[PDB]
Each structure stands twice: as C-alpha cells, then as structure tokens.
C-alpha cells in the first residue's frame, strides 16, 4: 500500500 510508505519513512528516520 503506497499510503503506508511515509509511515515506514518516519520510523526509519527516527
């Protein structure tokens, strides 16, 4: 789901 990509980005940039 493309709509979950930014959540993943947020998690990995923390």
């Amino acid at each position, epitope marked *: *789901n493309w*709509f979950d*990509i*930014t*959540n993943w*980005l*947020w998690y990995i*940039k923390k």
Partner: antibody
Amino acid sequence: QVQLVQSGAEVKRPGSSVTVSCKASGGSFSTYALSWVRQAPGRGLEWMGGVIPLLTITNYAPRFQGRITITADRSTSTAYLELNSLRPEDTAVYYCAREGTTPGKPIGAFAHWGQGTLVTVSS
Amino acid sequence: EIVLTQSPGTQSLSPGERATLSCRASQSVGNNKLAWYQQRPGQAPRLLIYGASSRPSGVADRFSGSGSGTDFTLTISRLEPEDFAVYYCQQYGQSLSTFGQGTKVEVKR
C-alpha cells in the same frame, strides 16, 4: 502550521494540457505524501493520484494512468499536477491535499487541503 | 477497485438529533484505513476521522467513527446547525484510494 497554496483558475481548450501547482509552507515537504483530488461541478470527490517527493514515488488512479503526471520540486516545496488530453468532463475544481500527522507520524488521510483551482475546459 | 457505498445519499434530520451515516465497502478495507470528511459549499473538504475511529485534534468530539472490515459508521451525537453539510468516506488501505459518493445531511422541516 501547514499551508497549501495553489495556482489560480484557468481556462483550457479541449485537447490541451493543464499544469496546476501547489506550494507548501510548514512541516516537512519531502517525507509526506501529497495527493490531487478533483470535484466536478455539483459532483463528488475523486482521488487522482499522489507523490512522495523524497522517494519520487508516484501513485496514479488507474482511470488517469497515462493521462496524468505528478511531480515535486523540493527546492520550492511545490508539487505539480499535469493532466493531458483535456475534455469537457475534466472541468472541475482540483485540490492538492497532504496527509496529516499525529500531535510527526503521518496518518495517510488528508488533513491539509489547498484552496482548489478551477480548471474550465472550453472553447 | 474498492467501491464505497454511502446510503442513503441524503438524510433529513433536525437540529439536536443523532445522525448515523453508513459507508459499506465492496471488499475489506486494509488495516481499517477509512477516513471521513465534511464539506460545505465553496470550501475544501475537512478531515473528521481517520483510521476508522481516530479523531484529529481540533475536531469536535460529537463526531465519532466506528466499524471495521467492510462496515463503517460516522456518528454525530447531536447535530449542531453547522453540521448540516456533505460527508464523504474514503478508503486508503490499498494504493488505489477511493471515495464514497457523499451523504448530504439536510434540515428537516
């Protein structure tokens, strides 16, 4: 905090292409998803597509695949919609919308909307 | 493509009454990624609920969302004058996001 400001109304001839812009201020432009949603006069909302700028990952609705381009310029925090081969049915208000954040974790759903851009397709 | 059905498309209600608005999906919505928006004439839509039941700060707590899978509900506990507007549901549980057709809540007289 986040504000989206779109380009002004435009009249376009049938068969032409339109570019609509959305300049964002506030928050983080590159890591949040920006979508375009349109609404024909007296009709409902239609999701068209979106982009995630950092990743240059676009996602278009199948109905518009082949007719749309969404791009993002991190240097100006501006996103662009191009819609080609315009027909009278494409007359609509076009909105940009950015996903919200928790009180920032992104939420997917569209918390922040531009003021809209009326594109009138006419001769 | 997930088809979201909002039926009825209009509800005629009185101020102070409870409203419940249905969104039924043609297939299960991934991770209950279902949002509700309000829209008034001449204005952009406004997010009321995301993730089926989460409410942004700023949004009145008389709006609540519930449901999962294919069966979602927006409840307005007590209608204020400003609540007479159009409400749209939206699923974003797969890459192709879709909206319902909208339900207009109008004043019965």
